[PDB]
Amino acid sequence: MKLEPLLSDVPRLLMEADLVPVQGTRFQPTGFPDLGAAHYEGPDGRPMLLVESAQSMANRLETVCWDKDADDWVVPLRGLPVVKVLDKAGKPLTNSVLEAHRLNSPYILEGKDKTLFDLLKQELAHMEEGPVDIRKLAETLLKVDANAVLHGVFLAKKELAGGRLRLPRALSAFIEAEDVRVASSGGVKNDHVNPSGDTSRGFGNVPFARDEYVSPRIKAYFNLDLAQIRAFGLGEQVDRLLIALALYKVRRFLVHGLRLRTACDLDCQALRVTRPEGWEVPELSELEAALPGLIEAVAGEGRFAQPAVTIVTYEK
Amino acid sequence: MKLEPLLSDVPRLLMEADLVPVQGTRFQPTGFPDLGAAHYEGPDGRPMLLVESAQSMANRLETVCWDKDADDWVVPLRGLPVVKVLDKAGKPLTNSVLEAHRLNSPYILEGKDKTLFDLLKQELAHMEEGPVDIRKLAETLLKVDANAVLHGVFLAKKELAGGRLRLPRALSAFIEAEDVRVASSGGVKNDHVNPSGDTSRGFGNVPFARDEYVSPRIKAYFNLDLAQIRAFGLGEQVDRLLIALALYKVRRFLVHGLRLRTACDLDCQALRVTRPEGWEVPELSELEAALPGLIEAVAGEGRFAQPAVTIVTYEK
Amino acid sequence: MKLEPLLSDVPRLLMEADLVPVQGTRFQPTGFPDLGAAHYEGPDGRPMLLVESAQSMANRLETVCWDKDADDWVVPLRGLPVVKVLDKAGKPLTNSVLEAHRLNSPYILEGKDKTLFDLLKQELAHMEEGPVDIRKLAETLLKVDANAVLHGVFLAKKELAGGRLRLPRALSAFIEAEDVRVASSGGVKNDHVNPSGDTSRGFGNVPFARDEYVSPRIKAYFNLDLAQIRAFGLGEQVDRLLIALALYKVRRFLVHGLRLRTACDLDCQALRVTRPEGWEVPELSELEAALPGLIEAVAGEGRFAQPAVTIVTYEK
């Protein structure tokens, strides 16, 4: 199955998914720590809502590839390089796919003993001072992390070139709602106040309120930066690998990732491409069938480090 | 069509372009160091925001025309003069096009090797007393690098005739959003949720606030000062060269700098011209074809220094 | 229309022109760093800003005519009296029309040898004692420098009658903006060298701040006191000449001084007269045609000294 030729010169891939609630007619947006529901006024003079940020979408698209039941990739993706962190007793604390800021985690790259630290220093020493090459950085990163190449990292740690080394996203997505109405609701924790009726110790009839939103058009947008992955220039095998991996993430999220929140019950009504016009998207079973071959090819080209999975122990 | 009729008709060239966000309805403007988003109140009585600084637009219009990996211009521009800065180990640490201070860059004119310093002093000695001839300076800049002619230079060095010499930029451009509106959305760290929130160790939890804007009209403005370059009087063919170089830079940025921040991604809806009225801008393929011949013509006029490329070594 | 009808009638001529920025809304006003932008509160309580100083508007009105490469007046103004200072080599250091203090300077009337010093002293000896007469000084200036009459002079040298002689400006103009709102901005000087960001040596990142302004009403005022020149009484033909010259200088400044600074790029929209009311100002082509004939007439009266151009050298 050929897909990279149809995406070998186009600068970016745009995909748009039309969502609808599974049951009822309402949904719950993300509770930002300051404002809660981040509603805003649209350019056309109509109310709009950021259903959830372009970060939560990324963390979900990143979880749908991992399996905590084994602390390893799902079988189709098995073999992709990843650093995994163990405690002093050998039980797995965390791995770089679940961490937030990748190799910049405080568990990773910082601790009592640091193998991956000396690896990163040995790799990037030539660029630690002066001009930085995003190709030499992207290859060093792909050596030890197979998906950060889609989400970026900031090597803030001062001893690593003062934090000069940086790399932005290549895949991004978010959900947006048009013409949002509001519904309001609340309740009271009506525990009987016969033995105690003071809220200080949690008794009483304490009330609460919460808001709910109604929108006739919710959209999930996905954007893939083909130009930058070409600008890495690691090889057409790597390019087709990363395109297939991104399509895989999107399909799995779209099929069974749409319970974003307890009251956020969502369904997919139709996916379509926006740019390039007239293209066709692979099916999920076809990506499942292709992925292990493309990963094998890239492993045979030696771009991955060996062993693919690398282990580090965390303690102060 | 040929471009010299415009060099006869008018004193200045004015263009504007309608930008639209590629997806969604909101974007990330520049974060200025002192204040963040540079919003202000408009004379018409409506709020608006400066998307980015005009000198950042200049650095981008320069970036879209040079390849640091190859250490040479894009194919149409090749052969134009430039100075490359060498490291003691022979690897090119930078060049005066990549750097933003052009000849004034502290790595240039400084260190144990300063051949370009004398190549300027040879005529700065004439400029030391009495008046200053802008056409003579513009000639000696065209002799060294045709980009400085386009973006201006200040020769602050005391030995360089007391730092008397300056030249304002002929091409200027900026983007601003009218009637802007605000959409705020913060976030929090996922990782390290279970352990203590000791932010000062780095081993902690951190929430943050983030803000992005909405606008019904974003425009990029481009201004080319024909009067000043004409008042250099270096020729007509050199004027054709500079106007082609500028209009190529515009078209070559209009399809590359469409994204400026990782969350700020736009596309051009249309391009329009203001001064002169009724003129039609040439296509990018036409400039691509014409430009090498104009460069060779001006080289045949003997304006460029020989060799066109200059090498200088920097140590400190 | 002829000029002398209004000169016989009215004591002063008042005109105003309302400006706009050609692109965008912001502009850069004058920047005396001991104050920065000069802002103040108006009579009606509104905030106010003088955009350009009157003395600098005058220096521009005197720099718009004359030509540096031709080293002489523009063709319409050609033939009017002037003095230029030559160096030892023989290339003119200082035309007097360009210089700040006009007929008073360390270059003219000061130096190892000086002819013009005696030429003025002879004509001012009878003004050394008793009351000074404006008519005699105005005659002497009109024979030596026909433009210094409109801008005024102060002969501070104690050798010239203790410096008692002085003459106020006849033409005054300035640019003023009303109901101003500020628009702050900034930037950073980036760097990419290997060793260190020593700002004391010019390396490393260095931020900076700048302030721009906007206004819904900005205009330039012009004032010419016909009473003052009528009080000089050099003649009706001389008055007609000076009125033509002033009008011409304004009508050309309006299409050559708009680019006051690198970031201002103003643009005139309309021009209106305030006193005399009901008058119609001439067009630029008419003054451009008429002016040489009036210079011929006044030369025929013998008011201009012969040779019209005075040559003098300077040596310490």
Choose from A9, A10, A12, A98 for mutation: most chain B CBs within 10 A.
A12
Q: Could you give the CA distance from residue B192 to residue B194 in angstroms, rounded to a whole number?
A: 6
Taking each helix axis from N to C terminus, what angle separates B115-127 and B134-142, rounded to the nearest 10 degrees?
Answer: 160
The chain A residues in contact with chain C (CB within 8 A) are 129-131
Is B215 close to A43, i.e. CB distance below 8 A? Answer: yes
Buried b (16+ CB within 10 A) or exposed e, B113-132: ebebbebbbebbeebeeeee
Q: Residue B63 carries which side chain, given as an amino acid letter?
A: T
Residue B304, CB-side half-sphere exposure with 13 Å CA sphere = 22
**Cα B277 off chain centre by:** 26
Is A129 close to C195, i.e. CB distance below 8 A? Answer: yes
Which tokens hold the place of B73? Answer: 């211009």
Q: Residue B280 carries which side chain, given as an amino acid letter?
A: E
Q: What is the DSSP letter of A7?
A: G
Distance from CA of B78 to the nearest CA of C (A): 25
Distance from CA of C183 to the nearest CA of A (A): 23
Q: Which method was it determined by?
A: cryo-EM
CA-based nearest residue in chain C for residue B59 = C190
Which residue, among B21, B71, B65, has the nearest Cα to B245 in the 3D structure?
B65
Q: Could you give the CA distance from residue B102 to residue C64 in angstroms, rounded to a whole number?
A: 31
Choose from A40, A97, A133 for mutation: most chain B CBs within 10 A.
A40
Residue with tokens 């203590």: B196
DSSP per residue, A61-88: HHHTTEETTTTEE-GGGTT--EEEEE-T
Distance from CA of A127 to the nearest CA of B (A): 11
C257: left (phi over 0), alpha (psi -120 to 50) or beta: alpha
How close are the terminal C-alpha atoms of chain C, in Å?
Answer: 50
DSSP per residue, C99-163: SSSTT-SSSTT-SS--SHHHHHHHHHGGGSSS---HHHHHHHHHHH-TTHHHH-EE---TTTGGG
Question: How many CB pairs lie under 8 A apart between chains A and C?
Answer: 6
Q: Could you give the CA distance from residue C92 to residue C75 in angstroms, rounded to a whole number?
A: 20
A206 touches A91 (CB < 8 A): no
Rg (CA), chain B: 23
Burial class of A305 by CB neighbour count within 10 A (0 to 12, 13 to 18, 19+): middle
Which residue, among B26, B257, B262, has the nearest Cα to A170 in the 3D structure?
B262
Chains with 3+ CB–CB pairs under 8 A to B are A, C
SS3 assignment for chain B: CCCHHHHHHCCEEEEEEEEEECCCCEECCCCECCCECCEEECCCCCEEEEEECHHHHHHHHHHCCEECCCCEECHHHCCCCEEEEECCCCCEEEECCCCCCHHHCCCCCCCCCCHHHHHHHHHHHHHCCCCCCHHHHHHHHHCCCHHHHHHCEECCCCCCHHHCCEECCCEEEEEEEECCEEEECCEECCCCCCCCCCHHHCCCCCEECCEEEECCEEEEEEEEEHHHHHCCCCCCHHHHHHHHHHHHHHHHHCCCCCEEECCEEEEEEEEEEEECCCCCCCCHHHHHHHHHHHHHHHHHCCCCCCCCEEEEECCC
Q: Measured between beta carbons, which residues in chain A are less than 8 angstroms from residue B182?
A: 40
Q: Could you give the CA distance from residue C80 to residue C72 in angstroms, rounded to a whole number?
A: 10
Q: Could you give the CA distance from residue C278 to residue C272 in angstroms, rounded to a whole number?
A: 10
Q: Is A268 helix (H, G, I), strand (E, B) or coil?
A: strand
Give C118's contacts (C-beta < 8 A, 6+ positions apart): none
C180: left (phi over 0), alpha (psi -120 to 50) or beta: beta
Q: Could you give the CA distance from residue C266 to residue C20 in angstroms, rounded to a whole number?
A: 6
Q: Is C219 helix (H, G, I), strand (E, B) or coil?
A: strand
B26 touches B15 (CB < 8 A): no
Q: Could you give the CA distance from residue B176 to residue B178 in angstroms, rounded to a whole number?
A: 7
Is B32 close to C93, i.e. CB distance below 8 A? Answer: no
